């Protein structure tokens, strides 16, 4: 969106991959500087933290993104 000038609510999760190829077929040499991520679940669920990190760097990070943070 910051590289191809598209509306806001344009190119959501349902239409990521088809809008990847609509841009590179529209104009080449502007897709080559784009840095994308290969992030996917079963890689975010699969960290091997154990022993003290499951309460001090994993559980307390998910508490800050809840509604009432200093009560949970």
């Amino acid at each position: 969106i910051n590289g191809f000038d598209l509306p806001e609510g344009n190119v959501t999760q349902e239409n990521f991959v088809d809008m990847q190829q609509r841009c590179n077929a529209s104009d080449p040499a502007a897709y080559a500087q784009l840095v994308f991520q290969t992030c996917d679940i079963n890689a975010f669920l699969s960290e091997a933290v154990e022993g003290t990190g499951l309460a001090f760097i994993v559980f307390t990070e998910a508490i800050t993104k809840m509604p009432l943070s200093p009560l949970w």
Binding site: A55, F56, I57, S69
Partner: protein, 72 residues
């Protein structure tokens, strides 16, 4: 002997509650208030509250320092 040090770490995170911006929610500023602290930006802020503001950890088991008053 060592399970009374884990409870020592647990009640340190209990004293640092009772404030709405939790101390493990955002990075501190360094000296000139223009950028973050360097290892809070490369790592996570929560990962920064454990190793530098709770433990003040060293790089090895050979290098040890003072008694670290708050923990005491």
């Amino acid at each position: 002997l060592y399970y009374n040090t884990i409870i020592s770490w647990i009640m340190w995170y209990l004293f640092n509650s009772f404030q709405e911006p939790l101390p493990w929610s955002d990075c501190p500023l360094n000296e000139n208030q223009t950028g973050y602290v360097d290892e809070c930006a490369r790592s996570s802020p929560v990962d920064y509250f454990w190793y530098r503001e709770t433990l003040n950890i060293s790089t090895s088991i050979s290098d040890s320092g003072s008694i670290q008053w708050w923990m005491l």
